[PDB]
Amino acid sequence: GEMMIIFEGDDLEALEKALKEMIRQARKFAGTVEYWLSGNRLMIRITGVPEQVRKELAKEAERLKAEFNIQVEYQIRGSGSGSGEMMIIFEGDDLEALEKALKEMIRQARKFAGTVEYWLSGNRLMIRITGVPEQVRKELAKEAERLKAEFNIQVEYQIR
Amino acid sequence: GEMMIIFEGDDLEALEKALKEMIRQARKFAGTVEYWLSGNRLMIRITGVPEQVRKELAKEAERLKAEFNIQVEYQIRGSGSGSGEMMIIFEGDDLEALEKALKEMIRQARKFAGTVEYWLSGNRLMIRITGVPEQVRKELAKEAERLKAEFNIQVEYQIR
Numbered sequence: 001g002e003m004m005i006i007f008e009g010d011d012l013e014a015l016e017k018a019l020k021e022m023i024r025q026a027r028k029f030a031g032t033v034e035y036w037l038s039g040n041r042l043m044i045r046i047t048g049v050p051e052q053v054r055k056e057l058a059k060e061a062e063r064l065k066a067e068f069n070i071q072v073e074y075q076i077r078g079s080g081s082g083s084g085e086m087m088i089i090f091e092g093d094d095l096e097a098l099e100k101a102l103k104e105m106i107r108q109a110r111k112f113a114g115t116v117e118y119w120l121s122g123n124r125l126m127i128r129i130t131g132v133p134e135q136v137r138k139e140l141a142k143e144a145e146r147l148k149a150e151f152n153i154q155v156e157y158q159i160r
Numbered sequence: 161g162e163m164m165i166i167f168e169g170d171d172l173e174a175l176e177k178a179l180k181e182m183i184r185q186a187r188k189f190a191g192t193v194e195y196w197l198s199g200n201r202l203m204i205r206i207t208g209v210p211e212q213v214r215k216e217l218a219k220e221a222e223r224l225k226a227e228f229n230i231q232v233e234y235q236i237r238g239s240g241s242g243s244g245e246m247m248i249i250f251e252g253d254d255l256e257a258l259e260k261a262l263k264e265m266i267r268q269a270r271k272f273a274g275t276v277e278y279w280l281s282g283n284r285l286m287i288r289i290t291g292v293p294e295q296v297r298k299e300l301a302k303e304a305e306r307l308k309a310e311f312n313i314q315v316e317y318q319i320r
């Protein structure tokens with residue numbers, strides 16, 4: 001089970017103060033965190049947490065709300081069984097080769113009933129593939145290595 | 161001048177079709193693009209474009225709206241003079257060292273009146289610094305190298 005939390009406030013010092021406390025509590029309960037600050041909005045994505053601590057982390061969210069005077073919202077995903085996550089990175093000085101490799105890597109993951117999230121910035125293209133089991137994450141890694149030699153691009157992948 | 165465009169639709173094939181056309185037109189007018197697809201929302205960030213083509217790119221957005229039956233919104237930033245962009249990447253197997261380096265890199269950029277955007281995922285920490293001139297982007301690169309040796313982390317930075 002995972003948990004998505006959003007913090008909003010005009011005081012950056014207050015947001016980051018709340019960030020420090022929230023991620024500590026989540027890690028205190030053996031949870032892997034991921035965060036992203038953009039403007040006055042702070043996203044905190046916590047994974048590997050069951051119903052027990054998700055009740056506590058939510059209570060911590062309400063507590064930091066009143067403490068630092070900021071807005072807070074969250075969503076909870078409990079049911080299963082699954083799945084998994086995968087982050088692939090493409091790099092190269094040829095934009096056409098990257099986007100062409102992107103189209104193929106997308107086709108593969110979506111053929112195997114997986115949801116993809118990609119981001120192109122400069123010469124780097126990052127792909128997040130969620131909703132896939134270990135049986136699939138090994139196959140996509142092979143296809144990622146095929147694209148590596150085919151379009152001569154730098155490729156890195158990490159599984160969690 | 162830059163331009164922010166958002167596409168929304170339940171048909172992924174329609175979004176990506178519109179994506180291909182929009183980024184071609186932007187690159188056709190010597191514009192550097194950046195895109196991010198998440199769920200049914202597609203962000204397209206175009207930079208290095210004046211009022212002339214921003215009128216055309218907007219018209220292209222309205223055209224793809226009716227063509228693929230999708231939602232479209234955009235924002236335009238024209239005034240100046242400036243500024244610049246900077247992407248710093250921290251990597252390491254120690255989370256405490258990364259976040260401690262993050263706090264310092266944040267302090268430096270915000271002392272020099274710069275806005276920061278950071279994202280922590282796994283062992284990688286990426287920092288986008290906007291609203292800074294060449295005089296500042298050289299100073300932050302030096303401080304990034306200081307943090308590199310201090311916290312023994314892998315550091316990469318790119319200027320645009």
Ligand SMILES: CCCC[P+](CCCC)(CCCC)CCCC
Pocket residue numbers: 036117118119126127128196277278279286287288
């Ligand atoms: C959930 C974290 C989302 C942030 P980004 C992660 C992309 C993964 C494919 C996408 C936003 C780009 C404008 C990268 C943030 C900047 C460092």
